[PDB]
Amino acid sequence: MAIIETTTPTEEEAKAIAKKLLENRLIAEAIITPALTKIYRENGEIKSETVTRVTLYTEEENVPKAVTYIKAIHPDPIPPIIVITPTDANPAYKGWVAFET
Amino acid sequence: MAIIETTTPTEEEAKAIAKKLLENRLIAEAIITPALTKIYRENGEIKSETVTRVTLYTEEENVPKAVTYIKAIHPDPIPPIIVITPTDANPAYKGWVAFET
Amino acid sequence: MAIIETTTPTEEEAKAIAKKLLENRLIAEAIITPALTKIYRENGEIKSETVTRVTLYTEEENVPKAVTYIKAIHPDPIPPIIVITPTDANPAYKGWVAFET
Amino acid sequence: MAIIETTTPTEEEAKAIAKKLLENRLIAEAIITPALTKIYRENGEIKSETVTRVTLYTEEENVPKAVTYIKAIHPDPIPPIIVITPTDANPAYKGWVAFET
Amino acid sequence: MAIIETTTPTEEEAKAIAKKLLENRLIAEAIITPALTKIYRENGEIKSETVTRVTLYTEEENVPKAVTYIKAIHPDPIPPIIVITPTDANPAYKGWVAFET
Amino acid sequence: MAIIETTTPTEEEAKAIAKKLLENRLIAEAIITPALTKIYRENGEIKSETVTRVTLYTEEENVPKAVTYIKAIHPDPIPPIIVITPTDANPAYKGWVAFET
Amino acid sequence: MAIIETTTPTEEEAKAIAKKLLENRLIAEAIITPALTKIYRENGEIKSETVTRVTLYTEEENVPKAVTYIKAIHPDPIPPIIVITPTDANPAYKGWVAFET
Amino acid sequence: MAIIETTTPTEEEAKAIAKKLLENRLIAEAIITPALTKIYRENGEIKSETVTRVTLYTEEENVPKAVTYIKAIHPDPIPPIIVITPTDANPAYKGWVAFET
Amino acid sequence: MAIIETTTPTEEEAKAIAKKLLENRLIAEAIITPALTKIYRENGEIKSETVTRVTLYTEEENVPKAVTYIKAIHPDPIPPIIVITPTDANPAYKGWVAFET
Amino acid sequence: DPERPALGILELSSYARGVKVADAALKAAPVKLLKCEPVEPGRALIMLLGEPEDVAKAMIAALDVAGLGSGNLIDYALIPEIHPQLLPFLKEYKKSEPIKDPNKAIIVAEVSTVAAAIEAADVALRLANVELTSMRLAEHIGGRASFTLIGDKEDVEKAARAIRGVAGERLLDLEIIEKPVEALIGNE
Amino acid sequence: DPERPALGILELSSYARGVKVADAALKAAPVKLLKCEPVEPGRALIMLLGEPEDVAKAMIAALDVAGLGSGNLIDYALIPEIHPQLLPFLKEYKKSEPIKDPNKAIIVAEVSTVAAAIEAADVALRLANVELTSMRLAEHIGGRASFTLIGDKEDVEKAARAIRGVAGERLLDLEIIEKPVEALIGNE
Amino acid sequence: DPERPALGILELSSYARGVKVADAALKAAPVKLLKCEPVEPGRALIMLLGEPEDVAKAMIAALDVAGLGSGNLIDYALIPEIHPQLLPFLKEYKKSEPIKDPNKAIIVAEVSTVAAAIEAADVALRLANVELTSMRLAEHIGGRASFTLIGDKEDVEKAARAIRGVAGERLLDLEIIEKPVEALIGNE
After folding, report:
1. Helix (H) or strand (E) holding K118
2. Is residue F96 a contact partner of residue F38, using CB atoms and an 8 Å limit?
3. Contact by Cβ (8 Å): F20, F73
4. Do E and D have ≥3 inter-chain CB pairs under 8 A?
């Protein structure tokens, strides 16, 4: 299995991406957390916003697939995707993530 | 060392698991974050809730041990446990995680 | 690339470390999340506080560098630093993290 | 491919085995030659008869199959079956033996 | 060395192929046996004829050569050629098959 | 096991060789087929005769033995012997060829 | 070859074991030396006696055999047997120890 | 296990060394034989005396230990110690030498 | 180094061999033990005598040399010589056996 | 014990090691030992039941003394709530009542360790309206295991996918059959 | 079934594979299944009887689905006419009646697979006036087999030569004894 | 038989070879055969008793025919005087009477061959005021063995040292326990 990590600038858009992702049997579960402040330099000036962070679960075979779809769907031209693979997992959730897809 | 990742449906229950885990010298530190929305299909219908997410620290020898106890104690029949191993760590916290256990 | 994970006991201090870290071209992005409860034994007694957790991005060559600076700057004598290396990443953000540094 | 070699004590019985073998799509071709004298010791005495010899073609996957059927059908309790694999064969007849089965 | 196995629908044609094969120093010996009954399904119907079977000798280097010529000369569009390599042979006939070619 | 292949210029002589071969417990079975036409160049001229072809069975240990005896007994100075080893054989005839020798 | 080393508490018994051992063609030679003092703790007290020591010769194949017989015959329940294999030996005595057995 | 071989110039002194060796749980058994004539050149002259020879048993772990003690205790400045390891031994005496130490 | 083992039928003869062996700088030390009973079959009859046993020390280079001389000098036509090489030895006696030769 | 008692399973490469583990565990908590016996091909199988916390402490002591990571331990498992259907086959092999419906489908599952077998079977019975039929445990088969289930084709495929997901690399062979014969019903 | 029924034997490395094979065979022909069970060291043994043509079609389907050549199959066999003496030992181990003649000789045969054992025993009993005494099948012995026979020395040697000829490389050990003791008669 | 009968033990890699060995031994001497059976993982175990000289001659013939040094033989043993306590467990597994003293200590011993097990157990019971409790022999465990004993801590350690000394490399695992639980007493 693996983990997909992503962010969106508004909650509703994150909900939309998660909804479209779920509709196509690409995933088993979706994880969202709001109220994220983004600080960065822009033309040399500090910024700060409020966005949401989104975490994902899937099995190792479907990771490139969800990555491809997220690239295809995400609003911003340069979209956040981070990949993580858990070291160990309980057999019950390996079965359950196989279950819900 | 390694990282243990888990969620519970209410804050109080997460506190209870963390408390019982700490009482038995199984761990050094516990990490909790509330206000987590869980969206999934159920009999083909979308859902949404509010739960808490819990992160853990320990050394590599005690990871199976905490996993076993969490299986033994967690309320829901099929409980969230995710394992992560940091690539590098400062010697000071390797010493300190050895410290508090 | 890699990931740097850290915590501070107050939000303002975390902002200060992030600001000083950014001023020296050591990093591309900074990630903060507040409202973190810390439970641990102290002389055998349970404790609980409210702190903030901070996540970082950089490329694999600059990881020791940011680690060194964070050691040099962080207020508490024994400071939290955790290192994580993503398994895969999109070429666009590899380019973009190279970009902003 | 391979070759199956067999004998029967009368021509009509050989025809019957070949016919039943062909009826079940087990083979592509059958080869018979009559007027075969069989000399052997029996209780220490010399004998001589007149029988027929039968040769077969098939591909390497169906050899055990024809062997099994011939065992199942041949009249005498201890029946002659010899197996031979041609070293080389023309592609045209490899195609044609695939053809007629 | 090796063995070449072939059949023709009439004796005279088999004689003609053997004669043309011998005229070009391609072979040392030819073997023919007549009165061969051919039973097969044709559009789902059983058949029976009378043909001749032809066996050949040569050394291992000239086998592809005779195969090529037989393809080039044989009357029927899809001609019978089977190849067999003897396991052992007497030195005298290895010398003699080298002899007559 | 193996196969021995031989020819003689007259039927009676082939019978004699087979009889003498059987009398000495060298073999289990003998196979003869008459009416064989032999075409070859002789001082550059084509020839044709009528001879008989003889096939043999034995087990792999006795093959050199029968070869030796056939060399010792066959009338013509340069006698036909061909050796063939079946790829597979039924256990029943392995037992039976062991039987009759 | 090898060497067998043993002791008995009286000379006559050692003679008896050697005699019975020789009667059964198990050995070639026997070696005895008397006047042996045995000092050991017994319930924590020092002891001293007078016994005999017995040395044996045989070849390497018969060593387990003599060991077995000595176990079977020796009076004391827990009997002394020590095994030694000479590094080198003269061919003459290898022949002679083969001789007398 | 192993064997320790030693000599002393008088019987009483050999008894004393054996006694002191046994008192400290260093050994299981001791072996002495008197009436030993020692012939050697001394300033170029032949000599002859009467001494005693002493043999020892122990297990392989305690051999250096007894060697050390014998060095520490033996009267003559340059003391005889020879070490021998039996090739084979009966399990009963391996148990018994473990026993008495 | 090595060990030489030998026996003689009388004490005086053993003394003579040891004396002649020492006179030629072939050895460092000699070891004799008397009162040895020799039991063996002779024309099928049991025997018993009283002889002496002789043990020797030398270094590994001089072993064949002493063997040769003992063959040259020993009275009985077929003389006892046994060779043994100690596994370990103290450096002090390696030096001392080098010393006295 | 709870109506779905917690079950602790450990398989060890030594018999004496299983003995110490049982001794220390029974020091730790007042759990009930179900079975401690040497099992083919010479392994030691320990089974125990009790309250979730007593079971937890039993495993505390067991893994503390087991020398984890030294290779003496091969596999381990636990389940909080054993499905009620499992319990009749848990104590002794109780051949289920004869098949009532002729048009059912059937599968057979094969694994390498008893823990994976029991865990996968429990999850599968948690899934569907499927019925267990047979199961064997590590005896005379060198520490392997297998079990069978029946049901309807769609939930059968659902269960098969869940089963591969649970088993992963430990899976040996999984299969499906749509219409079994009368000549095997009860004669499995 | 014929007085000497045809017997189909196949040993597989998988249990589920044996299940599919039995299902497909019983689709193919109305043969009678004698036994389908997991056998040591975890193999699947399938036994069936019927008419020669029904048996033939059963093997048709069985080898069609068995994945021949893929390594899942190890050995197979069939016999048209089982000697009548074999049949009493075929169903259950029926210890033969006590030995009546004291001067008989005896042999013991050992093989690696059940098919070679049964085939060789059938041919041997086809040979001589020899009597079978005992035989064991692949259970608790990791898929091996053995059987014994008694008779007179000359036909004993004849049978031994026939037995090596049949077995070939699959033979492990074959032996002969001329005068057994009273203390083993019935106590084998 | 003597009150402590001599016992001959040999384990072979072939069954027919054990048959010849038993036949030849019973030719050699009128000893009493206790058991000749195939044993896991297919070995042949031969047990016999009698007078020391009859036993000796039985081994004479047995090793003469056994083909010693050819690899067909793995291990062998004999004991002149079997301690009287061994004899009740020798014939059949007689579970000893319930434990009377609660403060006893206990050990468990594991070996690789039956001969080392029996020899070590005999010597250990020759040693101390210790009581044997259980023992298993090479069946369903692929030719291994194990046994247990109880006693007082000091003589327990003495026995453990004697046991390692006897076993040497053949020892697999040896252990000690000071205060066993009530929940294992009789439930071992």
Report:
1. helix K114-127
2. no
3. yes
4. yes
Structure tokens at B88: 């590098």
Q: DSSP letters along B55-76, please?
A: EEEE-TTTHHHHHHHHHHH-SS
Q: How far is CA B36 from the centre of its chain?
A: 15
* Rounded distance between C-alpha atoms, residue C4 and residue C66, angstroms: 8
- Measured in angstroms, the CA of C5 and the nearest CA of chain B are apart by 10
**Which tokens is L14 given?**
């072939």
Cβ contact D89:E63 at 8 Å: no
Sheet holding K73-79, edge to edge: K32-39, K43-50, K6-12, K73-79
Determine the Cα angle at A100 with ends A99 and B2, to 5°. 80
Question: H: neighbours with 3+ CB pairs under 8 Å?
Answer: G, I, L
The type of residue at D86 is P
Resolution (A): 3.9
Length of chain J: 188
What letter would DSSP give residue C25?
A: T
Spatial contact of A67 and A26, defined as CB atoms under 8 Å apart: no
Residue I49 exposed, middle or buried by CB count within 10 Å (0-12, 13-18, 19+): exposed
Q: For residue L47, which of L14, L90, L83, L86 has the smallest C-alpha distance?
A: L90
DSSP label at residue L160: H
Q: Which token pair is C62? A: 């600059």
Q: Is G34 on the interface with I (CB under 8 A)?
A: yes
DSSP three-state, residue L40: coil
Distance between CA atoms of K59 and D26, rounded to whole angstroms?
A: 13
Cis ω before K41 (30° cut-off from 0): yes
Instruction: Find the residue in K nearest to F58 (Cα).
Output: K165
Per DSSP, H78 falls in state S
The verdict on whether omega for the bond into residue J38 sits within 30 degrees of 0, i.e. cis, is no
Chain G: nearest CA to H47, how far in angstroms? 26
- Look at residues I93, I96, I73, I70 and name the one whose alpha carbon lies nearest to residue I83: I70
Please tell me the experimental approach by which this structure was elucidated: cryo-EM
Q: For K41, which of J106, J109, J141 is closest by C-beta distance?
A: J141
CA L168, distance to chain mean position in Å, is 16
Mutant choice from I6, I32, I40, I49 vs G, greatest count of G C-beta within 10 A: I40
Question: Does residue G79 have a cis bond before it (omega within 30 degrees)?
Answer: no
The helix (H) or strand (E) run that includes residue D12 is helix D11-23
Characterize H28-50 residue by residue with b for buried, 16 or more Cβ atoms within 10 angstroms of its Cβ, and e for exposed. Answer: bbbbbbbebbebbeeeeeeeeee
Apex CA A31: angle with CA B40 and CA A84, to 5°? 120
CB-based touch B/G (3+ pairs, under 8 A): no
Q: At what angle do helices G11-23 and G63-73 cross, to 10 degrees?
A: 130
Quick one: angle between helices L52-65 and L15-28, nearest 10? Answer: 140
Task: Looking at chain J, list the stretches that DSSP marks H as alpha helix, in order from N- to C-terminal side.
Answer: 15-28, 52-65, 86-91, 114-127, 153-167
Question: Over the Cα atoms of chain D, what is R_g?
Answer: 15
Task: Characterize L121-137 residue by residue with b for buried, 16 or more Cβ atoms within 10 angstroms of its Cβ, and e for exposed.
Answer: bbbbbebbebbbbebbb
Amino acid of residue A64:
P
Q: Is K47 on the interface with J (CB under 8 A)?
A: no
- Please judge whether L162 and H98 are an interchain contact, meaning their C-beta atoms are less than 8 angstroms apart: yes
Residues present in chain L in total: 188
For residue L42, list chain J residues with Cβ-Cβ distance below 8 A: none
- Tally of CB atoms within 10 A around H59: 16
Distance of CA K40 to the CA centre of its chain: 16
Question: How many CA atoms within 13 Å lie on the side-chain side of L17?
Answer: 23
C-beta separation of G86 from I82 below 8 A: yes
Contact C56, C27 (CB under 8 A): yes
Task: Using CB atoms within 10 Å of the CB of residue C60, give its burial: 0 to 12 exposed, 13 to 18 middle, 19+ buried.
Answer: exposed
Which tokens go with G61?
Answer: 């194949």
